[PDB]
Design an enzyme around this catalytic site. Structure first.
Site, PDB file in Angstrom:
ATOM      1  N   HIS A 161       2.680  16.824  -5.662  1.00 14.45           N
ATOM      2  CA  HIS A 161       3.824  16.550  -4.791  1.00 14.45           C
ATOM      3  C   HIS A 161       3.540  15.417  -3.821  1.00 14.45           C
ATOM      4  CE1 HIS A 161       4.348  21.196  -5.182  1.00 14.45           C
ATOM      5  NE2 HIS A 161       4.950  20.577  -6.181  1.00 14.45           N
ATOM      6  N   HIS A 212      13.649  22.764  -2.868  1.00 10.00           N
ATOM      7  CA  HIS A 212      12.566  22.537  -3.817  1.00 10.00           C
ATOM      8  C   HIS A 212      13.076  22.761  -5.224  1.00 10.00           C
ATOM      9  CE1 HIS A 212       8.469  22.080  -5.259  1.00 10.00           C
ATOM     10  NE2 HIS A 212       8.825  22.934  -6.199  1.00 10.00           N
ATOM     11  N   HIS A 232      -2.458  20.929  -5.693  1.00 10.02           N
ATOM     12  CA  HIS A 232      -2.445  22.314  -5.261  1.00 10.02           C
ATOM     13  C   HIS A 232      -3.239  23.255  -6.150  1.00 10.02           C
ATOM     14  CE1 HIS A 232       0.794  22.203  -2.221  1.00 10.02           C
ATOM     15  NE2 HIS A 232       1.217  21.162  -2.908  1.00 10.02           N
TER      16      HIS A 232
HETATM   17 CU   LIG Z   1       2.699  19.888  -2.322  1.00  5.56          CU
HETATM   18 ZN   LIG Z   2       9.436  20.332  -3.171  1.00  8.53          ZN
END
Ligand SMILES: [Cu+2]
Ligand SMILES: [Zn+2]
Ligand SMILES: [Cu+2]
Ligand SMILES: [Zn+2]
Lengths: 149, 149
Positions: B42, B67, B116
């Site tokens: 992201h 999101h 992540h």
């Molecule tokens: Cu992220």
């Molecule tokens: Zn997002």
């Protein structure tokens, strides 16, 4: 606001605030900066250290001048002069300047801050490279300059 | 062109090229990405890791949506989906997207790339945080996105 986390030998977080004007104030605590004395301190063209500090390229020079000191008119916009470390390698950065804005066509966001092994002679050393890099020598650390809250 | 040197547990240099259009192509080799499988990937709002990856803030969301996944219309501009690591922790990034331009009022320069620990559920996990972070979990590494040659 913008901010720089230093990567390399010399450690520190350098903040950038519009002050402003006009002028931006650059500050933070630096450690590991040897030997004691003056070290060149400059914004360079690219925010790329993928290949080491070498990949940040030359001094940020939007107005196409020669290397100088922060108070000269004939000066790269990226020429912040020298910072000073004490006997223990610690330095406090506290500089105000008006050629390093945080927006506009000549902003420094996404470029790089670089700190150097030697004194920057401010374009007065009469060395081969005095009028380009200030004869500042090796790049000890660099950080990409990032957008901050 | 822009570029990201990853800092943290997961290592790698991620390049960004206008392709273009329109679209930008993001690539590079990543290592240390455990465990094997899908990991959320992201662009976040601030290019500030001074306080750790936490300081990059929320997902880059210039068009103010929820999101989602990279193919949804209802999606943060920073939502690049998942990348995949093999059994040895190695991943190859190769993504094309049209909400992450290298200039303009909604450019990503000076923001941050974040990878992540968990899979990003693309806003479909029905978790508390599905519609904000994709339930992607811990930030393993981040890099500031920098101007490159
Ligand atoms: Cu992220
Ligand atoms: Zn997002
Ligand atoms: Cu320099
Ligand atoms: Zn210079």
């Amino acid at each position: 606001s913008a901010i720089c986390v230093l990567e390399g030998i010399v450690k520190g977080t350098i903040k950038f605030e519009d002050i402003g004007d006009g002028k931006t104030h650059v500050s933070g605590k630096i450690t590991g900066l040897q030997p004691p004395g003056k070290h060149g301190f400059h914004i360079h063209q690219f925010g790329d250290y993928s290949g080491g500090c070498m990949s940040t390229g030359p001094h940020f020079n939007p107005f196409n001048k020669e290397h100088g000191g922060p108070e000269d008119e004939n000066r790269h916009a990226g020429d912040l002069g020298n910072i000073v470390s004490d006997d223990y390698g610690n330095a406090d950065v506290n500089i105000e300047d008006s050629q390093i804005p945080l927006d506009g066509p000549n902003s420094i966001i996404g470029r790089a801050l670089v700190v150097h092994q030697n004194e920057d002679d401010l374009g007065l050393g009469g060395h081969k490279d005095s009028k380009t890099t200030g004869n500042a020598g090796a790049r000890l650390s660099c950080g990409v300059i990032g957008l901050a809250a």
